[PDB]
Structures are given as C-alpha cells and as structure tokens.
Design a binder for this molecule. Sequence first.
Ligand SMILES: CC(C)[C@@H](OC(=O)[C@@H](NC(=O)CCC[C@H](N)C(=O)O)[C@H](C)S)C(=O)O
Ligand SMILES: [Fe+2]
Length: 329
Amino acid sequence: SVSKANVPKIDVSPLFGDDQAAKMRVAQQIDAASRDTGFFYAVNHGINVQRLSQKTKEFHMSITPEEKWDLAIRAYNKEHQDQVRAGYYLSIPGKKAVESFCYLNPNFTPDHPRIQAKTPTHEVNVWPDETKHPGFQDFAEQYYWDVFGLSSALLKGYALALGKEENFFARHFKPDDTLASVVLIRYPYLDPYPEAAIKTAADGTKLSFEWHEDVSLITVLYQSNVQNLQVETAAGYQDIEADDTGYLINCGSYMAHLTNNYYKAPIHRVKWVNAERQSLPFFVNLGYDSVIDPFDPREPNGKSDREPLSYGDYLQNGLVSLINKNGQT
Ligand SMILES: CC(C)[C@@H](OC(=O)[C@@H](NC(=O)CCC[C@H](N)C(=O)O)[C@H](C)S)C(=O)O
Ligand SMILES: [Fe+2]
C-alpha cells in the first residue's frame, strides 16, 4: 500500500553555462518538481561522487573512540563548549546507531571576522590527526567547495523558476560567509539492532529519524544506494527511490517562508533499514545577515505580508527546534 514519489531526474548542466533558454528549460523542471512532491534528482552535476563516498567510508570505518571524544561536539564532551555545530556526533552502542561528522565553511578560521566577533552559528572546524587520516581534511574541504559550486548553480535555477534574475538567491550565497554545512552520516548495519534506535511512526512504519522540514534554503544530498527516505503527501508517505549517481534536492523552510509557501519545504522522514549506508547532506545556508524580501508568486503584484527574516536568526532558531522536536543527533 506504500506508493512511490515522483522524483524527476533533471539534467542541471545548462545552469553552469550560458545558453539562457536551456537554463529556462531547467528552471521549468525545477518549478514543476518544487510544486509537486518537492524533490528532484540533479543529474549531470559534474561532481565525482564515487570519490566522495570512498573517502567518507574510509573515515567512518577507521576513526577510533579516542579520536571521537577528541572531535566531539559539546553534546558528547563538556570540554568542548564552542562546538555546537562542527565536530563528531557519536553513536551510543546499544542505544543510538547513527554517527556523523559535521563541518562548516573552511574560511571560518580564528582570524575570520565573525569568529573574532564570536557571532552565533559560526565555528572553526575541527579535524582529525592528518597522520591517522591522510588526505581526509583536504578531501572534505575540496568537497565543500565542489558542492558549493553545484549549489550555486541550482540556486540560479530556483531563481529563474520563480521569475527572478538568476542571482536572486546566489548573491547571498558566498564563500566568505556562508553558514552552509556538510554532514558525513554513517548509518550502520548492526545485529542485533538496538531497539532504542528505532522509532515507530504514527502509521506503524519503523524509522531512524522522524518527520521534519529541513532548516535550509535548499538541501543538496548524496546518499549511497539504499532506499530509505519518504516524503509526506496528502495521501500519506511515499517512498523516494535511491540513486547513488545523483544529488537529491529539496527546499528548506527558509524557501517556504520567502515564497509564501509556494515552494513548500517538503515534510520527510528516514525509514529504519538495517544496512550499512551513507547520507551526506549539504545544507545550503546563506550569510548571518542575509535577508531576502518575501514575495508571493501567485499574486499579480508579487506582494507578501510576511516579514523579512535574517538568515542567522532563522538558522539559530531552526537548529534548536530540530533538536527539541527530533532529538540530539
Ligand atoms: C536526509 C536527511 C533527512 C538526514 O537528516 C539530517 O541530516 C538532519 N539534519 C540535521 O540534523 C541538521 C544538522 C545541521 C548541522 N549539524 C549544522 O549545524 O548545520 C535533518 C533532520 S535534514 C538523514 O538523517 O539522512
Ligand atoms: Fe531532512
């Protein structure tokens, strides 16, 4: 009785180019997806996703408990009070299956102005010892900028999709100040699998993570080839099929806000599947002070009554709400 979501494959290559009509044809497909289930697969994206998953896997499999404490966010290590976002999110054997490593803008160094100002949501990345994980930090920083580039292209598509000039979003998405994050998630195979780590949905479905709207402008996701996501529709949840060649894209609640919900932030959840897999989201966030004026594409005059929201405030509120609603990851 569980149906399958329409998730179109959209060749995004024209968004890297200068054929403006081809870009508009991409934008149309993004609009259509965004008004249907709210997910699509970006294909012909130019990122080497074989190397992403390989390098990600070598990390997760070889990091030791000593290293995880050293890298732990403050939820797992009281000594790390400045690590709210960036660092290692530990599994808890017998209790919590998932583990992950989050990093932010590589330009956030001790000498970046937002770090010197101690602005909330900005942190300096923490990295493992290079000798224990050769090439990992180089890999992960390069990956950040690779998915940054793709994301920039995607945002040109969303802008044209909504009738705006192509830099409408992208002009607020900058290497110097973006709050965007990468999370390298491992979902393990475990036998026996810990019951505490499996939630039961209202509809009976076993889940690893409950329903939510993403805290982002857009989310740009690579996952390995194990079907697990579901999107909510009026007729209930639908399976999103896996594709470990493409990036799965969806809007986050900042897009829904600024478009007067014309592009919804789709509600989605993660089914429990007992299988080793990877989930590598990139959360496209803008700069702390970025503000886009809301508008309503449905209205001839485009006007919305919604307040402009500063991205940094939105992000602070959102990440806290996620934790409170769905737990500490
Ligand atoms: C495929 C999805 C649903 C993914 O879930 C997430 O990554 C979750 N995101 C977070 O926990 C926010 C992490 C933010 C990060 N620590 C930061 O500071 O930017 C969300 C509910 S989308 C998954 O579990 O596969
Ligand atoms: Fe999500």
